[PDB]
Amino acid sequence: SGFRKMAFPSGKVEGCMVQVTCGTTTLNGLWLDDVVYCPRHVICTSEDMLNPNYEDLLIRKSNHNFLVQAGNVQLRVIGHSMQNCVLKLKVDTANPKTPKYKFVRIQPGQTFSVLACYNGSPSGVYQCAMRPNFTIKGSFLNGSCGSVGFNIDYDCVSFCYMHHMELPTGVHAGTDLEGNFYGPFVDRQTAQAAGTDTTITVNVLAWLYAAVINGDRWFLNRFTTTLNDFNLVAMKYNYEPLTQDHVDILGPLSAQTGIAVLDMCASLKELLQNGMNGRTILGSALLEDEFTPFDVVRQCSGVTF
Amino acid sequence: SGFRKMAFPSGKVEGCMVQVTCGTTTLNGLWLDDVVYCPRHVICTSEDMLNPNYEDLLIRKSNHNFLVQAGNVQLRVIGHSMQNCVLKLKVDTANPKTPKYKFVRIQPGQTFSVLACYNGSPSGVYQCAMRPNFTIKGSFLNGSCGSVGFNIDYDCVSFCYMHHMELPTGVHAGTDLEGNFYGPFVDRQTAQAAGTDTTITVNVLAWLYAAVINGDRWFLNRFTTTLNDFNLVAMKYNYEPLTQDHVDILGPLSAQTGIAVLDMCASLKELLQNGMNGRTILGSALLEDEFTPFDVVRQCSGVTF
Ligand SMILES: *[C@H](Cl)C(=O)N(c1ccc(S(F)(F)(F)(F)F)cc1)[C@@H](C(=O)NCCc1cccc(F)c1)c1cccnc1
Ligand SMILES: *[C@H](Cl)C(=O)N(c1ccc(S(F)(F)(F)(F)F)cc1)[C@@H](C(=O)NCCc1cccc(F)c1)c1cccnc1
Structure with missing residues (x-):
């Protein structure tokens, strides 16, 4: 008996979290196979977050400008590209702890577990719903970007969410793992309306x-x-x-x-x-x-x- | 921004959960070093749960009567003893995934994360408080016994709780990892009063x-x-x-x-x-x-x- 807001056990996702650094910005990345996935706003400086031209910013960057660290182990970046709002960093090493996994785009009202991370290290784990208005009501500080949402089915982890931003209202917006935002949100520091939320x-x-x-x-x-x-x-x-x-x-x-x-x-x-x-x-x-x-x-x- | 009931990341505790079988009873155990810890009611049959004489029941049992399984790997039991309400099973192998850890007896109003388990496998993870009346309001079905409560400090896991029982009221009672119950509870199927709970x-x-x-x-x-x-x-x-x-x-x-x-x-x-x-x-x-x-x-x- 009893009923609680239970998260999935986070062990399999813990083994994939890395820290990604570009200039002075540090955020979290997800290391699956020989690819590291992270929010593309890692390449942004304070003076360009109001209106970043991501294609122009990414051009000033080369593989060596991306510092990827899994624990104390420094990964070697042998390729970078941008898919929608995520950066894909090709590294020389396949993650030995890569779990069986899919990328899934979740539907509004579906639920998932968030492993909130800073500097590529886990803080904690909670159950979330994708609101009908494609936001989540989470717990996220500066540096939490790249933290992921997932569901587990036996042995397969289905990643559905990457954390990108907090709106001036205090709610949270992000993308699937192909870097497409849930909802109308864009990755820049401009006022953005979530719109009317409804109850599921x-x-x-x-x-x-x-x-x-x-x-x-x-x-x-x-x-x-x-x-x-x-x-x-x-x-x-x-x-x-x-x-x-x-x-x-x-x-x-x-x-x-x-x-x-x-x-x-x-x-x-x-x-x-x-x-x-x-x-x-x-x-x-x-x-x-x-x-x-x-x-x-x-x-x-x-x-x- | 945002505030959520966050559990600790459960990866380090996942690597210690095993399944313990004795006769027809199966429950969860915690494998640290070469010792497996589990509720002693694993040795009880349906006809003895109303008034078990644990010392007499344990006597009818030998090392080979305890089946310990970590994933598909069968552990070999080379010693058994009873400490208060827990059984300690000495196995031939040190758990390769044993984390840095202590046993802690928590104080009422302190909080911890529960990794709810069945058949030695994780179901999910939630944050709990030890109520002033030494119960917890959890989510636990038949077979969840041996599931553990913990806190993490950097790299050290501090185990504070092992799940033993549900009271007729639907709340949950258990022990520290030395097998001493929190509160006045005993491990038998008799009516037991939690007493007046207060707000922390x-x-x-x-x-x-x-x-x-x-x-x-x-x-x-x-x-x-x-x-x-x-x-x-x-x-x-x-x-x-x-x-x-x-x-x-x-x-x-x-x-x-x-x-x-x-x-x-x-x-x-x-x-x-x-x-x-x-x-x-x-x-x-x-x-x-x-x-x-x-x-x-x-x-x-x-x-x-
Ligand atoms: C990412 Cl590690 C992070 O915590 N951010 C963040 C920082 C910068 C950008 S961006 F670079 F992509 F320029 F675009 F701004 C996105 C996210 C924190 C954050 O959201 N900062 C901007 C806040 C803001 C203000 C006004 C309008 C907006 F749309 C956004 C962040 C803090 C807390 C939780 N998540 C993210
Ligand atoms: C353990 Cl795997 C389990 O789920 N139990 C359980 C079963 C037997 C005993 S015992 F053996 F130790 F004989 F003592 F009873 C303890 C726990 C379930 C359970 O609690 N069964 C008894 C319920 C009960 C009824 C009346 C008075 C009581 F004190 C207890 C269990 C079900 C759900 C959650 N946790 C445990």
Whole structure:
């Protein structure tokens, strides 16, 4: 019993983190095979971060200008290129600790573990959701850039996120491992709007299923509803519309609990319209939307990697 | 910016987890040097868990009855003993991945990372506090026993917790690595009272400092108070008494923020007496007490290991 925001075990990702230095800028890189991946803003100086011409900046740089360090071991750079917003540094040595891995572009509302790093060394590990507005609410200081987000499936690490920036609002923006930003963000120090964020409805419902599995039942009501009627209420409270695909994905939790998805939708409506009345669910006084239905099933049947 | 419940990176602990089997019971063990540590209830059968005589049960067992497996590699058991509630299995091989490590008995209100395991394999990693009543609010299924709690200081892992049991209430009890239970708990299937839990006041105050550092300031009031007066209010809301040692430990956060500790105490009193009025602090609609003042300082200056 119990339900917690659990990260993946970070050991396999720890073995790939390196430090990348170019001039005076130091940030984190990801060493897979004989390639090191890092944010291209490593080549930027303080005077060019307002409007960097990355193609012109990268031209003033050669392989020897990139200092890559894995622990105390200095790697030798034999090639550099730019892919979208990431730099790929070809090194003379294949990482002996390279795990089985893919690059994945995650969809909004999916979750992943962040290994926050400084100077190529790990600080800590937390579970995150890609918000509908393609930001994350993380914990990231100066130097955390190049820290990565991942999921694990048995032995394969699926990298989905590289940390690039903090917006003036205090939320976090980054790219996939091909260097394409999630959302409309660019890698320069200019004001950027994340836009209206919404609550991941399917995830809140997964969490209400988690709650019932663990004996929090007080919010279960005698009412049912319709996708259309529920969705009229979703839009009012800035919740993502619920679709039959969402309903289909909750099916295991429905089947487990014998609570029909639309009956949980009616429970959720009463909470949105009435609040929690100073009560709590799984230790929160708010509705939690950072657990996918896969995250509930994983946690509740004790899936190992 | 941002503030999150961050666990330590789990790589060094992953390399020490093994599976321990005795008869039909399988649980997790911790392989350090040539010793494997596990809950002694590994020797118990379903018919003896209500009132195990551990000394009599262990007598019916020999080294060959203990099956220890690190990945697919079967370890050879050349000695077994019982220390309090843990079994120590001497194996023929020193763990090649043994990290620099100590055993530590943690104090109530201290925090640590749990690597939840099944069949000697990691599921995930989360940050926990030892509650004042010596329980933890974790996520643990059948088979999670032997999962460990730790803190890291640069390169040294300090193991503080081994998971033993779930109480009928759904909270979690365990031992230090010398097998001494935190709290009054025993390792048998009998009803056991955790007792009244209290809120870790010093930790709530650290978290209010974290909140101010990150720009949540709405709860800051024009009132001050006294340790004695604050403590009159603490006892009413089941909060631990605040002592000058607590005040002393918050000093860095005081000094950083220029908010006197007793001024934060007055802020906290107004919240306890008035509630949050549907507002939120660092994304919670409740007062959070699972960050130590050391956890705030770590997270806010980006300490790596
Ligand atoms: C990267 Cl190691 C880092 O921590 N950055 C960072 C620094 C510079 C740039 S860039 F170079 F790419 F010029 F473009 F600016 C990106 C990221 C910190 C950071 O985000 N600095 C800029 C903050 C800012 C201000 C106004 C408008 C913006 F879009 C951005 C950083 C600090 C904390 C967390 N992550 C990153
Ligand atoms: C250990 Cl792998 C495990 O998951 N246990 C467990 C099983 C047996 C015992 S024992 F053997 F030591 F006999 F003593 F019971 C301890 C722990 C699960 C568990 O706790 N089972 C007993 C539950 C229970 C019921 C009533 C009163 C009690 F004190 C205990 C376990 C399940 C989930 C999380 N942790 C442990």
